[PDB]
């Protein structure tokens, strides 16, 4: 009765979502054949959120899995938890779309979104009280952006109060994995600003710096980047699925974040991560734990908060933990380091603690940060956009379905407005 529905779009969205159901199957203890084989009763205490219940005693994840590329479709199907999914919400087309953002909204996106929302409607009207929707995708590919933002747009037509919790993957600062990534980013975030409520920005270069330096992992594969992403994935829904002395579902984690309806781009983070060679050299206490939360190194978005002010900050917590110092230390990080928080939000940072740990650590936490330093991530990509658009770099692929030059104008104008808002509230 505070149920949320899962959404996966694009190859990056599928593999992140696949490894999310790897993780949730550990704290909820659901085996790859779906059955309960855990120990604690608190484990199946709020399983109704990410799962629906059972004919025969198993828990299929409520995850519609859309991707027009079938190569990632059987790749997740053949994974270790591809069996736990249901074949019904394996919605996919045999045809391919090579970063065709026009095709992803008007001709083949339109012919597929009816099939996709025929699944999403089934999983939304079948619940006592829907709390919201949440989607994981990439801003670079055409299926991550085109199918991603089209599903965000048409859901909001009939859902007034159900929040949308997008988990976004932004192109990297140093290099790109696709040359048309600024094009597929700018057009997609033109639909993310109006229609989403939380957009968690994940950066690949940020994940590399956490893995190489803090985790001391020389060769992190995609089974390791997604697990850091999946830590925050379960981190935002901690209190919603388990009891705590101060709970916070997604929706009081929304009003406590967004001052105005367009400032909803957040920095995710996981606090207690340390390399194997130095587990026994660092003491796991919440004074030590929340420092690694707030350093610029353990930030999953690759833009330095030192170049801006935090607007609103939360830190969700787990484990049997003292409430005095989690309250008194977040006094201390506000007040002694006060030039990097906005002065017009005095009681800036909130806490949201939980009684149960994750599987592996005695106490843990997950960082969410809404700062005005993320406009640099949007200022530099408008610069990456205005270099291509002044020469009409790759316009003739996008005009395959007759989307005009006029649509790119407000696509770029939405960013210049958004950056102008972020610079306006930087200086109050």
């Amino acid at each position: 009765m505070r149920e949320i529905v899962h959404l996966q779009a694009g190859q990056c969205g599928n593999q992140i979502g696949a490894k999310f159901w790897e993780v949730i199957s550990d704290e909820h203890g659901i085996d790859p054949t779906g059955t309960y084989h855990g120990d604690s009763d608190l484990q199946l205490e709020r399983i109704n959120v990410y799962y629906n219940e059972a004919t025969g005693g198993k828990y299929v994840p409520r995850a519609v899995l859309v991707d027009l590329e079938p190569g990632t479709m059987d790749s997740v199907r053949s994974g270790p938890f591809g069996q736990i999914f249901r074949p019904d919400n394996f919605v996919f087309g045999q045809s391919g779309a090579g970063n065709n953002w026009a095709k992803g909204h008007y001709t083949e996106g339109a012919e597929l979104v009816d099939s996709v929302l025929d699944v999403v409607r089934k999983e939304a009207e079948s619940c006592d009280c829907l709390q919201g929707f949440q989607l994981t995708h990439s801003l670079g590919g055409g299926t991550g952006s085109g199918m991603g933002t089209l599903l965000i747009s048409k859901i909001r037509e009939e859902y007034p109060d159900r929040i949308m919790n997008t988990f976004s993957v932004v192109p990297s600062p140093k290099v790109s994995d696709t040359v048309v990534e600024p094009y597929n980013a700018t057009l997609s975030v033109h639909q993310l600003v109006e229609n989403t409520d939380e957009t968690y920005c994940i950066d690949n270069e940020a994940l590399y710096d956490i893995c190489f330096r803090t985790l001391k992992l020389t060769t992190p594969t995609y089974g390791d980047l997604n697990h850091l992403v999946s830590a925050t994935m379960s981190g935002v829904t901690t209190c919603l699925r388990f009891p705590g002395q101060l709970n916070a579902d997604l929706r009081k984690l929304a009003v406590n974040m967004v001052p105005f309806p367009r400032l909803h781009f957040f920095m995710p983070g996981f606090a207690p991560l340390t390399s194997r060679g130095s587990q026994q050299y660092r003491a796991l206490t919440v004074p030590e734990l929340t420092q690694q939360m707030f350093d610029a190194k353990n930030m999953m978005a690759a833009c330095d908060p030192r170049h801006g002010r935090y607007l609103t900050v939360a830190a969700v917590f787990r484990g049997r933990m003292s409430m005095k110092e989690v309250d008194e230390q977040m006094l201390n990080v506000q007040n002694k380091n006060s030039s990097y928080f906005v002065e017009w939000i005095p009681n800036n940072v909130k806490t949201a603690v939980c009684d149960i740990p994750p599987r592996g650590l005695k106490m843990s936490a997950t960082f969410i940060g809404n700062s005005t330093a993320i406009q640099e991530l949007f200022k530099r990509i408008s610069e990456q956009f205005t270099a291509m658009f002044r020469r009409k770099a790759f316009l003739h692929w996008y005009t395959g379905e007759g989307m005009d030059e006029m649509e790119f104008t407000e696509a770029e104008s939405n960013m210049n407005d958004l950056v102008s808002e972020y610079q306006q509230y930087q200086d109050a």
Partner: peptide, 15 residues
Amino acid sequence: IDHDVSMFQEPAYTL
């Protein structure tokens, strides 16, 4: 701010 030096003082990390 003016914590007592008779007991523990609690830490003061920056960013």
